[PDB]
Ligand binder design. Structure first.
Ligand code: HEM
Ligand SMILES: CC1(C)[C@@H]2CC[C@@]1(C)C(=O)C2
Ligand SMILES: [K+]
Length: 405
């Protein structure tokens, strides 16, 4: 259903793309979004779906807008509008200058030095999951690896019990791919209800877990408030539970369908980090945006104060003006251009954790289960939203072709 076109939006710029249910979804979600880059589609279009909003369709505009926080504010960064208005996670809902003191604190719980200290446990968990799967000759990848591997690591980092995963995962998914049972505001209220007593507990009796570190932290040398600590911890949980989880499934679906790409990584393992970057480009998965702070003419188009603009991080790397033959996965691609982890002052703080999780997965899986395929018959379905994903990924292999390490 289509919101009436506002007076200021030109009719020739209308392209009614629905970011939560794109027309071409059955072709694969990145393909469905890539319809925005077909030959006669402008660089900046308006969709009347999901309340009405702009979409930048090309890397050049996506990058420019993410650099210009004075015109394109993160105070309302999600479509639809009621989700963006309710969204108050820190640091994402803040612009410079005030955003930066909170980044610095977040970076202390998810930054490179923390990832270094988690390295052994990440390795161990990946190995244990894959060894337990190996003799079985099949798995449901999304439930059996893509979910438990990154999520258990996050719950370890945060000092949260694993049995809380089903509830937290349900709430996080309502924020990014809602099934309709909860609004964003209701899912956020429920995440905060979970965190409130845990934050108070850990301010009274600090531990060394991520929640204690945020809740007792300072920002530019003054103490964080309880409310700030909640709004930061909520975001960290969303990052831990609904990013890498989805990305792994796109990457493994691809590797299951492409024996020659797996053979490349089996024959030349040194290539894994490069392969991780090219998969992060091809199977990019996030699309959020910004709100106009004022009336502003951008690339010949009159934007009005309060308009929302979706700036899909997914699209920059898929743009043939950034990467030739963008739908082709080439592990030797010379200049891998992408904004998969975002761009500008909100560049992902979890990207070092994400890459370590991805590269360990590829190394440890291909080492033990070098040969596998999609279960015969399976019609793999994607789902689209703020973070896109894979509904189910049934894999099979012959245990005789596997290796214990
Ligand atoms: C493949 C995995 C990941 C992708 C593709 C991803 C992508 C993104 C993108 C696109 C943004 C910027 C959003 C904006 O500008 O509005 C971002 C921000 C952030 N992400 Fe990641 N993310 C991933 C993994 C993680 C993980 C594992 C964590 C935490 C455990 C995390 C924590 C953060 C935080 C805290 C921010 C906010 C930074 C700020 O606003 O200054 N992300 N992520
Ligand atoms: C868009 C994101 C991937 C980024 C980290 C989690 C997420 C859903 C946000 O709310 C900011
Ligand atoms: K808001």
């Amino acid at each position: 259903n289509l919101a009436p076109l506002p007076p200021h939006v030109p009719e020739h710029l209308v392209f009614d793309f629905d970011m939560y249910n794109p027309s071409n979804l059955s072709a694969g979600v990145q393909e469905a979004w890539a319809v925005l880059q077909e030959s006669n589609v402008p660089d900046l279009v308006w969709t009347r779906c999901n309340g009405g909003h702009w979409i930048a369709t090309r890397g050049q505009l996506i990058r420019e807008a993410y650099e210009d926080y004075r015109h394109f504010s993160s105070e309302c960064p999600f479509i639809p509008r009621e989700a963006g208005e309710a969204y108050d996670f820190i640091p994402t809902s803040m612009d410079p200058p005030e955003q930066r003191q909170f980044r610095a604190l977040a970076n202390q719980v998810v930054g490179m030095p923390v990832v270094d200290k988690l390295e052994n446990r990440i390795q161990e968990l990946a190995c244990s999951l894959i060894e337990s799967l190996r003799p079985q000759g099949q798995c449901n990848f999304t439930e059996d690896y893509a979910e438990p591997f990154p999520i258990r690591i996050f719950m370890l980092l945060a000092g949260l019990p694993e049995e809380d995963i089903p509830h937290l995962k349900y709430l996080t998914d309502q924020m990014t791919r809602p099934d309709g049972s909860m609004t964003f505001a209701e899912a956020k209220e429920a995440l905060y209800d979970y965190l409130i007593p845990i934050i108070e507990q850990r301010r009274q009796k600090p531990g060394t877990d991520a929640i204690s570190i945020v809740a007792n932290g300072q920002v530019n040398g003054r103490p964080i408030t309880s409310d700030e600590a909640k709004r930061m911890c909520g975001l960290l949980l969303v990052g831990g539970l609904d990013t890498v989880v989805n990305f792994l499934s796109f990457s493994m679906e691809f590797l299951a369908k492409s024996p020659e790409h797996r053979q490349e990584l089996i024959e030349r393992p040194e290539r894994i980090p490069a392969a991780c970057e090219e998969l992060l480009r091809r199977f990019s998965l996030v699309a959020d945006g910004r709100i106009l702070t004022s009336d502003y003419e951008f690339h010949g188009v009159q934007l009005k104060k309060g308009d929302q603009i979706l700036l899909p991080q997914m699209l920059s790397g898929l743009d043939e003006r950034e990467n030739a033959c963008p739908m082709h996965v080439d592990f030797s691609r010379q200049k891998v251009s992408h904004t998969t982890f975002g761009h500008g002052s909100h560049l992902c703080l979890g990207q070092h954790l994400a890459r370590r999780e991805i590269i360990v997965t590829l190394k440890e899986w291909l080492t033990r289960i070098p040969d596998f395929s999609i279960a015969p018959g399976a019609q793999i379905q994607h789902k689209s939203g703020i973070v896109s994903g894979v509904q189910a990924l049934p894999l099979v292999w012959d245990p005789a072709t596997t290796k214990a390490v």
